[PDB]
Amino acid sequence: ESKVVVPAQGKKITLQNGKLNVPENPIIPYIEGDGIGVDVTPAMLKVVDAAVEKAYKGERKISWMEIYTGEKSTQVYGQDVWLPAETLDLIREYRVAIMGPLTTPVGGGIRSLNVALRQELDLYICLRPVRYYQGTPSPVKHPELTDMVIFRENSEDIYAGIEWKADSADAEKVIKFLREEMGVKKIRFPEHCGIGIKPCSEEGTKRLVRAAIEYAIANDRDSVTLVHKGNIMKFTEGAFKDWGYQLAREEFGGELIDGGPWLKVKNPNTGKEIVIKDVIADAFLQQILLRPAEYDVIACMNLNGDYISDALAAQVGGIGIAPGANIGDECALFEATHGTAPKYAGQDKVNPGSIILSAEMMLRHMGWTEAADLIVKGMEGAINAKTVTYDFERLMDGAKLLKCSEFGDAIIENM
Amino acid sequence: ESKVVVPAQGKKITLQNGKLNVPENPIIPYIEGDGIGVDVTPAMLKVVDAAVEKAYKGERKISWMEIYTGEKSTQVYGQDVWLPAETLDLIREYRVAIMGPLTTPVGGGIRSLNVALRQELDLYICLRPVRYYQGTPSPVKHPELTDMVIFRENSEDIYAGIEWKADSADAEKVIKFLREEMGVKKIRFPEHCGIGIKPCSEEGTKRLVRAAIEYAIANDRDSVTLVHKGNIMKFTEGAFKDWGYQLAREEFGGELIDGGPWLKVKNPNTGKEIVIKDVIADAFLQQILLRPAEYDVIACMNLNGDYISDALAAQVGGIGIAPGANIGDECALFEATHGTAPKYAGQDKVNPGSIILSAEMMLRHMGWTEAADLIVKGMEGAINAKTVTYDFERLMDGAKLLKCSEFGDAIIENM
Ligand SMILES: Nc1ncnc2c1ncn2[C@@H]1O[C@H](COP(=O)(O)O)[C@@H](O)[C@H]1OP(=O)(O)O
Ligand SMILES: Nc1ncnc2c1ncn2[C@@H]1O[C@H](COP(=O)(O)O)[C@@H](O)[C@H]1OP(=O)(O)O
Ligand SMILES: NC(=O)c1ccc[n+]([C@@H]2O[C@H](COP(=O)(O)O)[C@@H](O)[C@H]2O)c1
Ligand SMILES: NC(=O)c1ccc[n+]([C@@H]2O[C@H](COP(=O)(O)O)[C@@H](O)[C@H]2O)c1
Ligand SMILES: [Mg+2]
Ligand SMILES: [Mg+2]
């Protein structure tokens, strides 16, 4: 029997013609998250409620509905229930949802719960914006030069989870097929050898890049950079790059700049020329440090996006306050992007900034831009005030140390 | 007919019991390299000759022997000769060799020449040390905290080059085998889909990690960190990590620290405890910025090593002076790690620091540590003097701009 309680007051968000219809009293499912989820999620709920109350003068209000995945799900639904079918149904039904960090168990042969949510719900965009908040302690000299938006492909690549263990019957069978039927001679050591499969498709690539370009247009961004290791992986990463450029030409009027390969796409709303370009992935990890100002919207495959979003977050001092969304055509799931940090769980200590800024993305996604703007303003003021959680405080002089809950209040105080 | 000229004076380095036997007059093959190879290679030859002359008072001298690969090879050997069989034979025969950057052609369906050299010669270690040279302009606040040595696996991973183009007969055949014979259901879009194969073996992993641990022992380093994305790629990256820890236990007496998973390995020469630990790859790209001092020797797979070595080089301001070696059991090939930068080729402008420091690694590999130490000392003094090439000069105030050749001389001046 379901243990989810549908709020008495509240209405379901609906979707018509690829446009969300958000009532004044939307029901929003949330997953508390494991470990420090118990600390950051309540802070998020309070900050969001305050921003919504202030922005719309009580006309609008979210009806929060708790749903389950992770350790807490096992405590609620029983022994091996880490991801209840109901959770997939409810996120799809209610269209917009948010989650804290999740514990995926080890030793039971089950794969990342975050990835499972993304794939099962076909949330093919992992959207991770990375900007600098003035006053944040950073390991780099000029973090203010970083203002990028990562569109990470979320449904394919080596994340597909297709692989077989060394010495297993399945692995030997695949290896035999490769060597004997496909004539593969490039496996250096075919014995005691694990094998993984990396898929990349035209449809998967183009839906991701299409979203990135539409985002650059909608937000008057300066460029979209396709990041790939296509010089080594010609038919996956290289194909991603080629299909991305092709999509720009075929759907957005992209035209050759000089002798190429970069293209220009005209923003149909502002007339601005958006540059479509590409950078090889290893070099890109250098470029984001050395020439951050030259980059804006990034479009890349699953694994590369994983790496890039972490590297960027670190450089702006944002390891614990990096927002993230997982967006598909039918629903969207916003998430804390850090781990469960169980050593601090329940101590009201850690930074709720990541889940709060993912909630900012959520409000913006709902078209509640005024409430979203208040969170940004609040976050900016609290950090500028040097009234911060231990993770910032320990890197600064003259800061005031706040608990997790207290930092949530500081954000509200600065709205 | 071979166009290589074996130096009249000079003797072949030999290998006995896994130990190099280097004569006083060793013949060393070198590949000039394409593009800026014409600039940096002569600088390297002069600096190396000076260090060798100064260190051993004329008793020792390298007999340089030019050999070919890349664009220049086509000019020498003819039309489609990008990598002559002779070059593979000569590097193996002469045991130690060095190369500038290489041009791999596009449109002819041939794969990276650098990777081809590594795989054909079974140079399974890509060795990339990253340290800071005082006075180098860096984008980070504390580059001096970075002093790491990357052991990047060089013979397997997705670098194997096993892949098939979307819509090709081969791809469709592999996909059919996967879905129909292996029961694979995780391919999101099986049509118009490129496919790549990622192998990781026990033997490939252990020979790489074995070298990393022997290096930590030989050089009294503090730790070896296995970097991997094993939480998603369980049977390749995860297997790499597990096999690495296992090798530490089985061959080096590694013992559990506390409740694990980190191990301690006792240095049999100094008694120092070497920590064996692991970090997930995305988090590691954050850790090298935020806690660089905690890391030392790194052991990782091919693609991860590609990314990590670039990210580290950038942060120490070393994008154009990063040294690199490719080492196997029978021979070794040292390399400039930057590209061919054809826009500047022949202008005597670019930084020869990368190929010079790879030559430092080469001298050290030969047991000519005194000559190697002189190059390090020279490089340190020239940079400290602010007498540098344009790539450093443009980021500094009060520097003296030197040509490529002139920076080579500055290094010698500071020996
Ligand atoms: N919201 C947060 N605020 C502060 N630190 C965080 C946050 N999230 C993660 N961390 C850091 O990441 C670690 C948790 O890692 P994980 O959950 O991935 O296993 C914590 O130890 C903490 O670093 P630290 O212990 O140095 O203070
Ligand atoms: N040894 C070097 N010294 C200075 N810059 C270098 C060096 N090697 C590469 N570069 C930079 O990399 C580029 C060459 O890229 P590639 O060979 O990978 O296609 C050059 O434009 C240059 O940057 P820049 O043009 O900004 O001065
Ligand atoms: N118009 C273009 O397509 C364009 C412009 C600038 C840089 N690039 C890219 O940057 C690299 C070097 O460019 P530069 O001409 O700025 O040195 C090349 O690999 C090129 O692909 C392309
Ligand atoms: N003795 C050990 O094995 C050891 C020590 C320190 C950190 N770690 C690793 O670091 C992470 C957190 O460690 P802390 O106990 O320092 O917070 C854990 O994932 C753990 O694997 C392990
Ligand atoms: Mg990640
Ligand atoms: Mg590289």
Curated annotation (Swiss-Prot), chains A, B:
Cofactor binding note of this UniProt entry: Binds 1 Mg(2+) or Mn(2+) ion per subunit. Both Mn(2+) and Mg(2+) can be used, but Mn(2+) is 10-fold more effective than Mg(2+) in vitro at the same concentration.
Oxidoreductase found in the keyword field: yes
Residues annotated as binding D-threo-isocitrate: 112, 114, 118, 128, 152
Description of activity control: Inhibition of this enzyme by phosphorylation regulates the branch point between the Krebs cycle and the glyoxylate bypass, which is an alternate route that accumulates carbon for biosynthesis when acetate is the sole carbon source for growth.
A molecular function GO annotation: guanosine tetraphosphate binding
Chain positions with Phosphoserine modification: 112
UniProt record similarity statement: Belongs to the isocitrate and isopropylmalate dehydrogenases family.
Function: Catalyzes the oxidative decarboxylation of isocitrate to 2-oxoglutarate and carbon dioxide with the concomitant reduction of NADP(+).
Protein name, as recorded: Isocitrate dehydrogenase [NADP]
Gene source species: Escherichia coli (strain K12)
Organism classification: Bacteria, Pseudomonadati, Pseudomonadota, Gammaproteobacteria, Enterobacterales
